[PDB]
């Protein structure tokens, strides 16, 4: 097509109308452009707008196409008012309030359609499943005005006779019936059914949810509501052995199942054993201890490393309070036993606050506590989907405090938020805001024990850096070592007689991380990946710092109390729901890093975060 010509265009220029056309073959697209053109003019009050012809012509030798359209334009009409009548259900106030307009407003066909949809939507809340609403426009040319009449027939109230589910081969029927707001034996509400659709999507157990409202062949006023779902395969067994002569026996395994045999329970079993580290975790929860939404769950864990050992338990109870808002709280206990601790300044500052007096640069030491705690939190979640959100936001605020009788006295609070906002109507172009903040502290002269410190960097927070490397680094004291003959520039007993910096991260009691990601369509890949492959572009920032680091005593070292040392990076990432679970592939480059930082630009890990 070399040229599209619009003949008789006087209200607008050619380019203004061409700007909205999909054509720049003519097949099918032409009808879409003609409908766009009609709506474009109708939205400006051109009550008499008409398309007279649509010639399509071939150029010589079929080397091109020439497209011309003949347009007849009228004047601009004003809408004087709207009259509504017919067999109304009595809800005249809502219809009149929706219909009311400012008199003299430029006639707009779209607002008329809106009024029609708003009336049907209104009637759908009181059980009128099949109303009939038809606009009857009238044109008064003498005054360049229009008037509207609406023919409304509310119809009958409909009741739901049964609710049936199809396509659930594993999930227990009780699960599908919990996330419902339409009850059997009561009048139909269209919005209540849509809420049920959204809740089923939010469970995260299905690839898709379809709905239908089939009329009952045996009666004029009953409806059979049907949901169809397609179950997602989630939760995978992991087992493996890594035997060799360097490490001997190396065992790992676990179960990470979000829906256990389709019964509604979530279970996490994880563990591993090797010559130096031991780890085990068990986490079990029931989203519905009670039928009305009270949940229960908890976890047990054990680990050690040869140097520390720790273990503990916790139990959490929680419940919804306002549909989109829920609360959690619980109790727990942890044992922490340390040995052979390195002579670090931050660690010993803490130990001093606890009343300890370790010998200088002497690793022949130990320390252990038993700490009972209380934890709590609040969650907000109005997302439309479990894996690829398009709208809504999520806010997760959690924290914990010690209770009397514990060895430590501290508190910790974290805040994890994300917001998805669509850009285009197809929800393929979306902007994602992702943020995290946190802070902890101590009481009575003590500080938060170092094993609870925050870390940042890695695929879960700030991309492009090595995991747990963002933040203050260890500073060592210069006593004896059985390793020097494995050493460190600051650790050697003979080669170091003063303090110096190393690359060991210690974390800190406060952090902030933020990023912006743009979600884009993937037209390069087959459509069967539309619900499994997503790509994005992103820009990350973050910072971690150590509250009350004493800059007056260690003046030859950076002042770790200044939070302004913001680290920045950006890159590209791919999200894929693989047959075996979500995977995250990314590459990013830094914009700004500080002395001691360590980079890692190519990253790959599991997701299930944020």
């Amino acid at each position: 097509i070399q040229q599209i010509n619009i003949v008789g265009n006087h209200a607008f220029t050619t380019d203004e109308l061409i700007s909205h056309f999909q054509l720049r073959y003519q097949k099918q697209k032409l009808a879409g452009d003609l409908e766009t053109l009609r709506s474009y003019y109708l939205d400006r009050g051109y009550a008499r707008f008409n398309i007279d012809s649509t010639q399509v012509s071939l150029t010589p030798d079929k080397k091109g196409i020439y497209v011309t359209v003949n347009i007849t334009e009228g004047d601009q009409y004003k809408l004087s008012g709207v009259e509504v009548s017919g067999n109304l259900a009595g809800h005249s106030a809502e219809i009149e309030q929706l219909t009311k307009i400012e008199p003299g407003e430029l006639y707009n066909g779209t607002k008329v359609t809106k009024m029609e949809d708003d009336i049907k939507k209104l009637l759908g809340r009181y059980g009128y499943a099949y109303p009939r609403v038809q606009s009857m426009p009238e044109i008064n040319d003498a005054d360049k005005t229009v008037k509207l009449r609406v023919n409304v027939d509310a119809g009958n109230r409909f009741y739901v006779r049964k609710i049936r589910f199809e396509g659930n081969d594993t999930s227990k029927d009780a699960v599908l019936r919990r996330e419902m707001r339409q009850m059997e034996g009561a009048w139909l509400g269209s919005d209540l059914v849509d809420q049920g659709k959204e809740r089923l999507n939010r469970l995260g157990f299905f690839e898709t949810v379809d709905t239908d409202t089939q009329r009952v062949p045996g009666s004029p006023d009953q409806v059979d509501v049907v949901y169809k779902v397609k179950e997602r395969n989630t939760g995978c067994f992991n087992f493996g052995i890594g035997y060799g002569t360097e490490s001997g026996v190396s065992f790992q395994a676990g179960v990470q199942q979000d829906n256990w045999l389709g019964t509604g329970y979530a279970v996490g079993i994880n563990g591993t054993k090797n010559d130096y580290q031991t780890y085990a975790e068990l986490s079990v929860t029931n989203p519905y201890f009670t039928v009305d939404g009270v949940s229960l769950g908890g976890r047990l864990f054990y680990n050690d490393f040869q140097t520390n050992k720790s273990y503990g338990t916790d139990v959490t109870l929680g419940f919804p309070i306002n549909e989109y808002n829920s609360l959690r709280a619980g109790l727990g206990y942890v044992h922490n036993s340390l040995s052979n601790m390195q002579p670090q300044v931050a660690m010993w500052r803490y130990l001093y606050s606890m009343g300890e007096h370790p010998s200088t640069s002497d690793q022949d030491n130990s320390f252990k506590t038993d700490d009972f705690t209380f934890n709590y939190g609040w969650t907000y979640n109005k997302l439309d989907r479990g894996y690829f959100p398009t709208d809504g936001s999520r806010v997760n605020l959690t924290g914990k405090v010690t209770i009397p009788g514990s060895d430590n006295e501290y508190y910790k609070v974290t805040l994890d938020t994300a917001t998805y906002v669509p850009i285009d109507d197809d929800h393929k172009w979306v902007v994602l805001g992702r943020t995290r903040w946190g802070y902890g502290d101590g009481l009575g002269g003590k500080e938060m024990p170092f094993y609870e410190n925050f870390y940042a960097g890695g695929s879960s927070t700030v991309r492009g850096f090595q995991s747990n490397t963002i933040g203050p680094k260890a500073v060592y004291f210069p006593q004896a070592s059985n390793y020097d003959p494995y050493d460190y520039e600051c650790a050697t007993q003979d080669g170091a007689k003063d303090l110096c910096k190393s690359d060991d991260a210690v974390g800190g009691n406060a952090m902030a991380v933020a990023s912006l990601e743009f979600i884009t369509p993937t037209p390069f890949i087959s459509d069967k990946y539309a619900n499994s492959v997503r790509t994005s572009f992103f820009w990350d920032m973050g910072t971690v710092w150590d509250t009350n680091w004493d800059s007056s005593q260690y003046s030859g070292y950076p002042d770790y109390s200044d939070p302004s040392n913001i680290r920045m990076s950006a890159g590209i990432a791919l999200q894929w729901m693989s047959p075996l679970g979500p995977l995250v592939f990314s590459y990013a480059q830094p914009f700004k890093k500080y002395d001691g930082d360590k980079a890692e630009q190519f990253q790959f890990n599991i997701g299930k975060t944020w």
Binding site: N233, T234, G235, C236, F237, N238, F239, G240, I241, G242, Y243, G244, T245, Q252, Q257, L261, P579, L580, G581
Partner: peptide, 18 residues
């Protein structure tokens, strides 16, 4: 399908998704 095994001293492992 939906199952993976490997053997690779050794790194034998497998995954089975529900």
């Amino acid at each position: 399908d939906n199952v993976r095994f490997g053997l690779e001293a050794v790194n034998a492992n497998f995954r089975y998704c529900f």
